[PDB]
Amino acid sequence: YRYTGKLRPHYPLMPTRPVPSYIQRPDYADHPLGMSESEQALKGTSQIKLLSSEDIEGMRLVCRLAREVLDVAAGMIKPGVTTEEIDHAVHLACIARNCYPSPLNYYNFPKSCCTSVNEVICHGIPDRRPLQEGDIVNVDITLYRNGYHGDLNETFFVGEVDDGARKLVQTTYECLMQAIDAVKPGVRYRELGNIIQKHAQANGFSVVRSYCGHGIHKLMHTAPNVPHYAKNKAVGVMKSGHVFTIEPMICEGGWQDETWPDGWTAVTRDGKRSAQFEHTLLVTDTGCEILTRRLDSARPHFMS
Ligand SMILES: N[C@@H](c1ccccc1)P(=O)(O)O
Ligand SMILES: [Co+2]
Ligand SMILES: [Co+2]
Ligand SMILES: [K+]
Numbered sequence: 577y578r579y580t581g582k583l584r585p586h587y588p589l590m591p592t593r594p595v596p597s598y599i600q601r602p603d604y605a606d607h608p609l610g611m612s613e614s615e616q617a618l619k620g621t622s623q624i625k626l627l628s629s630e631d632i633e634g635m636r637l638v639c640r641l642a643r644e645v646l647d648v649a650a651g652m653i654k655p656g657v658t659t660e661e662i663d664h665a666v667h668l669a670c671i672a673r674n675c676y677p678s679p680l681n682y683y684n685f686p687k688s689c690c691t692s693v694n695e696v697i698c699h700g701i702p703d704r705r706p707l708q709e710g711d712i713v714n715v716d717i718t719l720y721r722n723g724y725h726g727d728l729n730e731t732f733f734v735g736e737v738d739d740g741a742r743k744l745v746q747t748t749y750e751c752l753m754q755a756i757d758a759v760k761p762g763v764r765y766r767e768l769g770n771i772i773q774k775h776a777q778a779n780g781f782s783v784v785r786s787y788c789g790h791g792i793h794k795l796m797h798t799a800p801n802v803p804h805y806a807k808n809k810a811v812g813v814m815k816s817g818h819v820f821t822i823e824p825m826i827c828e829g830g831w832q833d834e835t836w837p838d839g840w841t842a843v844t845r846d847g848k849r850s851a852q853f854e855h856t857l858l859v860t861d862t863g864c865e866i867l868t869r870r871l872d873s874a875r876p877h878f879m880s
Contacts, residue, residue, distance in 0.1 A: 581695040581847030586704035610684040626817040639726035639867035650877040659691035663702035678718035690716035697842040709735035728868035729854040748851040759864040766810040773806035784825035823854035
């Protein structure tokens with residue numbers, strides 16, 4: 577395999593971490609290839625669940641706890657910390673909240689969160705590499721509680737970063753937030769990519785095509801598929817009671833991605849940097865409720 581940049585995996589990985597049996601597990605947790613029967617049973621469906629009130633309470637709770645766990649990871653970000661160390665803390669923090677770390681064995685993903693450094697677009701696997709001054713790192717958290725998943729991510733600065741890193745991360749965040757600000761009933765899901773790409777391109781960045789935002793609730797990934805680029809053909813129209821993510825990945829160079837031999841780590845084909853933010857959203861009537869928002873502080877961690 578020819579790496580696209582400077583980053584390399586740092587093996588070996590620690591033995592997978594067990595989750596105590598008192599924590600409720602999603603279907604894929606014990607499937608030998610980590611396949612989710614319940615997702616496979618709706619594969620290729622465009623229909624979007626309208627959440628009951630009970631479903632809404634369930635999502636509020638899991639997304640709140642997911643934010644708490646992300647905040648834990650955010651407090652650990654500094655030079656010399658490894659991504660495995662971050663994942664270990666996340667793993668214990670999920671268990672402390674009586675939640676299952678959704679990534680763990682999802683289609684055999686080996687860890688409890690995703691750590692994506694520099695040219696990694698998403699789904700980086702926590703490993704023995706220590707964070708370096710000047711890196712940007714995304715941590716993606718997903719928790720499962722009482723049958724519901726809640727999903728968010730942020731990109732962080734490790735020490736001081738260069739102006740390009742600052743502008744990439746800020747623009748990405750603005751892309752997310754401009755998309756969220758358009759969410760309300762009657763808006764087509766395919767419109768969000770128009771908005772995101774417009775802002776990205778205005779600042780000289782590209783928008784990853786291969787990965788999309790998604791419905792989420794009882795399933796981790798389900799309808800709708802929510803592309804982040806312009807002139808996409810996503811199916812469906814927002815309605816009160818819909819729950820889904822928006823998670824744009826924006827890049828300094830070209831948009832094209834490829835995957836490491838591990839089967840997960842997605843990297844820019846050009847080796848330039850990519851950044852991401854993600855929220856889980858509920859469509860209401862005034863608009864939308866950001867289920868994964870911070871409750872105690874105005875801004876994402878990178879500003880703070
Ligand atoms: N949280 C994410 C995830 C976790 C684990 C495995 C695959 C994707 P994504 O849906 O945001 O890409
Ligand atoms: Co995520
Ligand atoms: Co997601
Ligand atoms: K990245």
